[PDB]
PDB file of C-alpha atoms and ligand atoms in Angstrom:
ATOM      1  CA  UNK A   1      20.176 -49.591   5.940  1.00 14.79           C
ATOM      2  CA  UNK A   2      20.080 -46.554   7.707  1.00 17.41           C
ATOM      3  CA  UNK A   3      23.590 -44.099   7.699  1.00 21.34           C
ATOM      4  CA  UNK A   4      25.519 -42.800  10.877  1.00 24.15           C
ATOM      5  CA  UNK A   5      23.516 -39.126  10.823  1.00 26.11           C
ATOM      6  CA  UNK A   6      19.978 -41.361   9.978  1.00 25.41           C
ATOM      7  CA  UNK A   7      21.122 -43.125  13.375  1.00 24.91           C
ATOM      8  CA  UNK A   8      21.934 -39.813  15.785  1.00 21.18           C
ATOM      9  CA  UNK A   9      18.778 -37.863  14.168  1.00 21.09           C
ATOM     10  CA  UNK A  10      16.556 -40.830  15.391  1.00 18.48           C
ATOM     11  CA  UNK A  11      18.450 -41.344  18.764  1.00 20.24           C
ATOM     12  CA  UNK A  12      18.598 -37.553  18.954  1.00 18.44           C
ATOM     13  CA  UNK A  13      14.898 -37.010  18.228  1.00 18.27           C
ATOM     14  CA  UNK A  14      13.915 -40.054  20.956  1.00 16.82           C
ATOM     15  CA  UNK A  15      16.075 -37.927  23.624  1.00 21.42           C
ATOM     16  CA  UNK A  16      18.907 -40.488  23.658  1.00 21.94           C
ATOM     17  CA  UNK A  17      21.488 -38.267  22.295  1.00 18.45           C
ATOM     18  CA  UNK A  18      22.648 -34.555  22.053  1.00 17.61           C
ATOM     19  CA  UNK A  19      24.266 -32.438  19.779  1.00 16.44           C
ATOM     20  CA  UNK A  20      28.063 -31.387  20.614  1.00 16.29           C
ATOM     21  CA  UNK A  21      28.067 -29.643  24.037  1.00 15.55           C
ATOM     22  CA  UNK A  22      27.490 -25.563  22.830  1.00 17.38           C
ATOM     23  CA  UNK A  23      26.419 -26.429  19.411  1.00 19.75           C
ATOM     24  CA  UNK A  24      23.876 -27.727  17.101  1.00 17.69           C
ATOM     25  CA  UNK A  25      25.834 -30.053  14.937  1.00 15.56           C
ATOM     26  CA  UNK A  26      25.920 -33.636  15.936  1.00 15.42           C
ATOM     27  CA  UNK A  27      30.290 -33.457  15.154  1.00 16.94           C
ATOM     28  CA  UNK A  28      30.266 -37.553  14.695  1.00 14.69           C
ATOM     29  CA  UNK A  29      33.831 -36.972  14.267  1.00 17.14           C
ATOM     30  CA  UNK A  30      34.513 -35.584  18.062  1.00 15.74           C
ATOM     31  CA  UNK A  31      34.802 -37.553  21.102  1.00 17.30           C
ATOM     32  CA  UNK A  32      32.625 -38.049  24.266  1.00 17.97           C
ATOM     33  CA  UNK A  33      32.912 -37.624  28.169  1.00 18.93           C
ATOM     34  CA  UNK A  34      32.058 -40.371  30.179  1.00 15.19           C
ATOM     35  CA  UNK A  35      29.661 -37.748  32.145  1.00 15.18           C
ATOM     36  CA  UNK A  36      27.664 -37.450  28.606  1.00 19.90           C
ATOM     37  CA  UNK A  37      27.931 -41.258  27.673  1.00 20.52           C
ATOM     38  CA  UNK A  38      26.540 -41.954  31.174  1.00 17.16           C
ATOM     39  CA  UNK A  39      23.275 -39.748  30.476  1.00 19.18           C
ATOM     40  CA  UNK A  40      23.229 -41.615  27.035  1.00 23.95           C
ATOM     41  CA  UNK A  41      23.185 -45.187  29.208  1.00 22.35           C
ATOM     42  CA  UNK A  42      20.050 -43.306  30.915  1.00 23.30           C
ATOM     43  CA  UNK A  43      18.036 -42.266  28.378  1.00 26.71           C
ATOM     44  CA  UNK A  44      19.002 -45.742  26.135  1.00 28.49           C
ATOM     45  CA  UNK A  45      17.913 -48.066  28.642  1.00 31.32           C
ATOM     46  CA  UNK A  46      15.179 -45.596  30.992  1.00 27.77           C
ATOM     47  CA  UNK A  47      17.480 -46.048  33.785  1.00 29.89           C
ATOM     48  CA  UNK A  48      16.170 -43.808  37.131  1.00 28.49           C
ATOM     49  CA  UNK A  49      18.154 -40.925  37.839  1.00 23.55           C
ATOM     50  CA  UNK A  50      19.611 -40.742  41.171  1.00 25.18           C
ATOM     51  CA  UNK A  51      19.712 -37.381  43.072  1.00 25.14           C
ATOM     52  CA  UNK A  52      21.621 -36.576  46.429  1.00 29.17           C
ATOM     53  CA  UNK A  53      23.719 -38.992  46.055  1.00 30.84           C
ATOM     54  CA  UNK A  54      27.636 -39.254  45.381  1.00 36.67           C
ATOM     55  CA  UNK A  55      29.578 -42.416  44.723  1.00 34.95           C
ATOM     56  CA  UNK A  56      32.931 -40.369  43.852  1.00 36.85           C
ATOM     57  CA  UNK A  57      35.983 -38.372  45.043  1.00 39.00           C
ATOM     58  CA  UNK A  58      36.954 -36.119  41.656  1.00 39.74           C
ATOM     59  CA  UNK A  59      37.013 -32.272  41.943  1.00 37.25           C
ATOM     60  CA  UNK A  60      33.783 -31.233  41.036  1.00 38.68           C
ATOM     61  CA  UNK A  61      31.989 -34.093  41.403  1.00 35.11           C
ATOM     62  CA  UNK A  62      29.048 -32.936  43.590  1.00 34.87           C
ATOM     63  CA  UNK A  63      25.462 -31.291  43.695  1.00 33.79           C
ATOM     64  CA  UNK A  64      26.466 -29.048  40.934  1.00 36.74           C
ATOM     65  CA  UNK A  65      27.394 -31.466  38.186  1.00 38.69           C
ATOM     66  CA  UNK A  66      25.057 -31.892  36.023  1.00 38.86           C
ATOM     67  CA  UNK A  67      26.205 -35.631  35.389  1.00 36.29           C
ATOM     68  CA  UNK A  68      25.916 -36.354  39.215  1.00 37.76           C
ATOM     69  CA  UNK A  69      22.195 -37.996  38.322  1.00 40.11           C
ATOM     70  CA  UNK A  70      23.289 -40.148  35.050  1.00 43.12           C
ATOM     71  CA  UNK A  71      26.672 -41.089  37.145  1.00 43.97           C
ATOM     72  CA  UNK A  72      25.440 -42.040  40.202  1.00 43.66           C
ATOM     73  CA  UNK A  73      22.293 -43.846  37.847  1.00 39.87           C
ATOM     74  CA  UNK A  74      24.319 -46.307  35.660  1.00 37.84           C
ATOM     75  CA  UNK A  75      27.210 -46.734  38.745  1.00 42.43           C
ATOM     76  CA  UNK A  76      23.932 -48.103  40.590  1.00 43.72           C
ATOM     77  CA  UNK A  77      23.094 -50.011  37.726  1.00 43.74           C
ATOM     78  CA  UNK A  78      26.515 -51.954  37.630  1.00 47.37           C
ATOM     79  CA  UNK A  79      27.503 -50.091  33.931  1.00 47.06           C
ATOM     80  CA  UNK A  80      30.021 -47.908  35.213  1.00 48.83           C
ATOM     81  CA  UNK A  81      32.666 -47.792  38.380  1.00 51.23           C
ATOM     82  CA  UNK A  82      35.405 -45.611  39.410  1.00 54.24           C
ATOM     83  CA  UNK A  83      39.145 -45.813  36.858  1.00 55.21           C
ATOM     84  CA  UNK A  84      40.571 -45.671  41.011  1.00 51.68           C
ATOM     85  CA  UNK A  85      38.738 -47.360  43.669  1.00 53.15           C
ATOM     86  CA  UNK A  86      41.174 -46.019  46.262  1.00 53.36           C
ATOM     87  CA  UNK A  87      40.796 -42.416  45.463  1.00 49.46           C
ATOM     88  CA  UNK A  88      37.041 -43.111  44.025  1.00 47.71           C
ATOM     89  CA  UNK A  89      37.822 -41.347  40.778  1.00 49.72           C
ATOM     90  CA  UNK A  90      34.962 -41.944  37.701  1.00 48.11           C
ATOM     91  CA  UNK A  91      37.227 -39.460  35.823  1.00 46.97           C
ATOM     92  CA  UNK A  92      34.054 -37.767  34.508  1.00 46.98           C
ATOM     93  CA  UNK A  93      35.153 -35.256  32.471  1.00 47.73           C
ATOM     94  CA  UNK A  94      37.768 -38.184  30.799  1.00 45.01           C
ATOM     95  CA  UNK A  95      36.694 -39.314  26.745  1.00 44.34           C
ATOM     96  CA  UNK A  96      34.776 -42.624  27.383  1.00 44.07           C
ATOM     97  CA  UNK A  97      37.344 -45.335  25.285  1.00 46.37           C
ATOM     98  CA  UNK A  98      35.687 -47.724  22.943  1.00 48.37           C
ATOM     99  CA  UNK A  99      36.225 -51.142  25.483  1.00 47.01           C
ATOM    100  CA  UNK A 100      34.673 -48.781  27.886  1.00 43.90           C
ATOM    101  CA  UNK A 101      31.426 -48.364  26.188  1.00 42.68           C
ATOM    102  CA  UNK A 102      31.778 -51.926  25.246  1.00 43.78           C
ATOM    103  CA  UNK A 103      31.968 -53.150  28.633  1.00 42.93           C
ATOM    104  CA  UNK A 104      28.729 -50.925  29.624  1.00 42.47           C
ATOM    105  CA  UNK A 105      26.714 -52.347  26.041  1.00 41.37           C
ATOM    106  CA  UNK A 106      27.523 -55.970  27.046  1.00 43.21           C
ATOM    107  CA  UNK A 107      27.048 -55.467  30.471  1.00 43.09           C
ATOM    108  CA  UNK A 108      23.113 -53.718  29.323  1.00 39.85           C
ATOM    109  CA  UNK A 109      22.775 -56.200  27.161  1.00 36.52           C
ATOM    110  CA  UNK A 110      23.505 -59.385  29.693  1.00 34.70           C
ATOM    111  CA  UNK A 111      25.939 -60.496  26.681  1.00 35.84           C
ATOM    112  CA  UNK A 112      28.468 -63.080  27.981  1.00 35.89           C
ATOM    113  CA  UNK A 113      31.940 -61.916  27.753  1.00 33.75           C
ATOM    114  CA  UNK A 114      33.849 -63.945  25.699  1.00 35.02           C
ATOM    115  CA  UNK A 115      36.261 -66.797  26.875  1.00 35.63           C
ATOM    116  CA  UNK A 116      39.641 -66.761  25.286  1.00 35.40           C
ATOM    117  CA  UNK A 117      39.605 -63.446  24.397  1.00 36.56           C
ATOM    118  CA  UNK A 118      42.421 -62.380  21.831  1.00 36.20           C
ATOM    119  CA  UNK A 119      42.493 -58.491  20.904  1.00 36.47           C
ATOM    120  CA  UNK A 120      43.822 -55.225  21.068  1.00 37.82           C
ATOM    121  CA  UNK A 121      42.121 -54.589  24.518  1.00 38.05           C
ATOM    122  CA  UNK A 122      43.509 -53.380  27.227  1.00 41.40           C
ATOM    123  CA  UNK A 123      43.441 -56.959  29.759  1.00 40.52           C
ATOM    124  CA  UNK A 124      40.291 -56.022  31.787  1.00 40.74           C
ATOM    125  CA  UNK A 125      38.199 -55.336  28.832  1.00 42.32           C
ATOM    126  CA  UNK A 126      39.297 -58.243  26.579  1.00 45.17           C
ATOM    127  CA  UNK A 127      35.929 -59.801  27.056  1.00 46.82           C
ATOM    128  CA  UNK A 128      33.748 -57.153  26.903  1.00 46.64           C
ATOM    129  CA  UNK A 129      35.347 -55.673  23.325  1.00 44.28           C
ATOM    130  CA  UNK A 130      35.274 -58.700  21.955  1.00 45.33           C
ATOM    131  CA  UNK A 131      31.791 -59.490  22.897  1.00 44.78           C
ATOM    132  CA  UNK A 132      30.751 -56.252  21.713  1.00 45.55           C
ATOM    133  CA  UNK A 133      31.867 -56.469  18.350  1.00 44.26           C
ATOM    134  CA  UNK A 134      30.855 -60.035  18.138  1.00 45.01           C
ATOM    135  CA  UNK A 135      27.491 -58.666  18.503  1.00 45.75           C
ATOM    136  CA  UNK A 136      28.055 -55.792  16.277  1.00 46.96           C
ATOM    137  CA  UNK A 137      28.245 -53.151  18.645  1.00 48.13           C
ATOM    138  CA  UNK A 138      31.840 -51.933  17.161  1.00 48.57           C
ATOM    139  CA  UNK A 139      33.705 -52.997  14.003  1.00 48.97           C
ATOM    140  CA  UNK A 140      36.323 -55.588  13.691  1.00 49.40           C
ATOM    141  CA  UNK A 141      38.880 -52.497  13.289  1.00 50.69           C
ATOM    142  CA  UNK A 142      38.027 -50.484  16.262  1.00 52.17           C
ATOM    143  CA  UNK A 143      40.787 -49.865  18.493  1.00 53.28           C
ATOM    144  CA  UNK A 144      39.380 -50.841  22.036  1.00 50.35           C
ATOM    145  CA  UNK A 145      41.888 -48.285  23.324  1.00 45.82           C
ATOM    146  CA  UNK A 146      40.617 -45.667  21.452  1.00 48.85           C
ATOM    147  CA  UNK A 147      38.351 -42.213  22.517  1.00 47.92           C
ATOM    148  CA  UNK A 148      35.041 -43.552  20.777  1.00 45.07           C
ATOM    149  CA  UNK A 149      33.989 -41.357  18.330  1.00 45.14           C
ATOM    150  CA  UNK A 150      30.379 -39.835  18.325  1.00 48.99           C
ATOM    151  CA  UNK A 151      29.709 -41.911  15.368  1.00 49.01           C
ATOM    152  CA  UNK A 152      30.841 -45.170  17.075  1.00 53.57           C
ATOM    153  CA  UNK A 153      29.207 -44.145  19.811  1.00 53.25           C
ATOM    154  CA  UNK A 154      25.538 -43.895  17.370  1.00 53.85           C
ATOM    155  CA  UNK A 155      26.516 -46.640  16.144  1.00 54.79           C
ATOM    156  CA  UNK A 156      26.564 -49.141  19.121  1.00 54.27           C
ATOM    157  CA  UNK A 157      23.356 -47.127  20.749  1.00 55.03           C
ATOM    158  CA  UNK A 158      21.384 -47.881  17.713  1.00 52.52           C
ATOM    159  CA  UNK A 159      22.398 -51.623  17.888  1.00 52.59           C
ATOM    160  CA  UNK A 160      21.756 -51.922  21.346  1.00 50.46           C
ATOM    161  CA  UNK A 161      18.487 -50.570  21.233  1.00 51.01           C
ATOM    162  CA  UNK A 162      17.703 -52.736  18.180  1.00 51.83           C
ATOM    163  CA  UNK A 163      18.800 -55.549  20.824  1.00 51.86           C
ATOM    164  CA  UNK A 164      16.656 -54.433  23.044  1.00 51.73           C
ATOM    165  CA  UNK A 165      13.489 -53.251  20.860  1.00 51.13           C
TER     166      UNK A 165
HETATM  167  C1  D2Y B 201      46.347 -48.523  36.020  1.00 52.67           C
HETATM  168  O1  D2Y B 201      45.394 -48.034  35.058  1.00 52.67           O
HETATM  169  C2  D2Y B 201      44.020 -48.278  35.431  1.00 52.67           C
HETATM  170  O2  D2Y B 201      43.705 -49.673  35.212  1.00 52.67           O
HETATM  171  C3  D2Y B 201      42.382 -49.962  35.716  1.00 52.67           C
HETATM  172  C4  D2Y B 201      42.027 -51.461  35.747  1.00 52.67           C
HETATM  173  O3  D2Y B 201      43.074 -52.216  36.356  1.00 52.67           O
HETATM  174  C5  D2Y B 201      41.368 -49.268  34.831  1.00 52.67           C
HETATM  175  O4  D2Y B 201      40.101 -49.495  35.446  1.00 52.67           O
HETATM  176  C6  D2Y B 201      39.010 -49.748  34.564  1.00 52.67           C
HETATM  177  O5  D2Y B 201      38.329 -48.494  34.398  1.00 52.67           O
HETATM  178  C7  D2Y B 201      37.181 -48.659  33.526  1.00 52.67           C
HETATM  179  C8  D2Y B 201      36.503 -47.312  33.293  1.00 52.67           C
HETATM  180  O6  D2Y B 201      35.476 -47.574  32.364  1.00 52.67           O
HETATM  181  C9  D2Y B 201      34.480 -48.596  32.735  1.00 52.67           C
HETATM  182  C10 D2Y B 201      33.557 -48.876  31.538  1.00 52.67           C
HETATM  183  C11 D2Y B 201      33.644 -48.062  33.872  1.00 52.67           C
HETATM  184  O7  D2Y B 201      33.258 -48.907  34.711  1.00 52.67           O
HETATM  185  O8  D2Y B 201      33.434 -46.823  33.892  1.00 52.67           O
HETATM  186  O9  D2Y B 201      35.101 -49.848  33.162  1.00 52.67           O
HETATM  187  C12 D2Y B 201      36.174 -49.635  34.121  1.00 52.67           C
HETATM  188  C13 D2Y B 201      36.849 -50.962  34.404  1.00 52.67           C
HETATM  189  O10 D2Y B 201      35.924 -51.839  35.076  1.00 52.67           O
HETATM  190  C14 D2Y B 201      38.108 -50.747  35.245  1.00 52.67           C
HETATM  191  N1  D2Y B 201      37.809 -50.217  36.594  1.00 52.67           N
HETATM  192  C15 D2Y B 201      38.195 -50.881  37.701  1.00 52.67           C
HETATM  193  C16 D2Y B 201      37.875 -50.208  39.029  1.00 52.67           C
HETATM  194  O11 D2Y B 201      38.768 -51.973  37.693  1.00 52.67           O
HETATM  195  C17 D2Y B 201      41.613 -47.749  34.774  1.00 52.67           C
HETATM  196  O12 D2Y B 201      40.871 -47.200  33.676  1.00 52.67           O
HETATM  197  C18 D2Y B 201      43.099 -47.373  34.597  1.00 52.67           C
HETATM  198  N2  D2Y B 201      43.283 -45.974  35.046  1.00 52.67           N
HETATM  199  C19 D2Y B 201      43.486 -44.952  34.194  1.00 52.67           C
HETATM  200  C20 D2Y B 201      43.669 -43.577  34.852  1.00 52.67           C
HETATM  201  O13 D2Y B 201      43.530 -45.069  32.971  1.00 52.67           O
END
């Protein structure tokens, strides 16, 4: 039964995740960008990066974001879309919210979202949290709402890889 560091040092090790941006402590306490949890989606499932292409409106969303690649990989992909798909906003550089990361897991995963859905999730995402902690992706007691932590976010990678391997 492996611990939360256990989980990020193997993930971390296999390329899936990084240490906090500047630093070499993994900081399972902090939160995560959905720019960084995109390139996590990458390297978790070996999704193709996607180059000279842009999908979104936000300031700096361009040729010299880093994320542009992972973005652009897992919006291809179906994981991710824009918060505003008037103004095309991914809001990259917003924390990625626990029925967020739940919605791209299940999504990965081709888990059903669940029918009659009753939660603390916002109404979009009813399905997908639920579905995600049925499959043990997130505990009962996450609050869908919530920033995911970095340890939440190990967490659910390790499971879904598990899932997958
Ligand atoms: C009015 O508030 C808006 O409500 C929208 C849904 O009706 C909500 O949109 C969701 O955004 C989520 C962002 O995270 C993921 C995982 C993603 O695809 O990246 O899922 C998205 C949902 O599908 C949904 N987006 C849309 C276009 O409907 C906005 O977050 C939310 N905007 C903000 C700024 O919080």
């Amino acid at each position: 039964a492996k611990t939360t560091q256990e989980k990020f040092d193997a993930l971390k090790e296999a390329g899936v995740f990084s240490a906090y941006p500047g630093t070499t402590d993994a900081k399972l306490g902090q939160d995560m960008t959905r720019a960084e949890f995109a390139k996590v989606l990458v390297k978790l499932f070996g999704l193709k990066e996607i180059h000279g292409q842009y999908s979104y409106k936000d300031k700096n969303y361009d040729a010299k974001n880093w994320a542009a690649p992972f973005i652009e990989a897992v919006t291809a992909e179906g994981l991710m879309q824009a918060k505003d798909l008037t103004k095309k906003i991914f809001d990259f550089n917003g924390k990625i919210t626990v029925e967020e990361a739940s919605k791209t897991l299940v999504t990965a995963l081709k888990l059903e979202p669940v029918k009659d859905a009753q939660n603390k999730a916002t109404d979009w995402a009813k399905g997908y949290f639920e579905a995600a902690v049925n499959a043990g992706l997130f505990s009962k007691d996450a609050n869908p709402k919530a920033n995911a932590t970095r340890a939440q976010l190990v967490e659910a990678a390790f499971a879904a890889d598990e899932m997958s391997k």
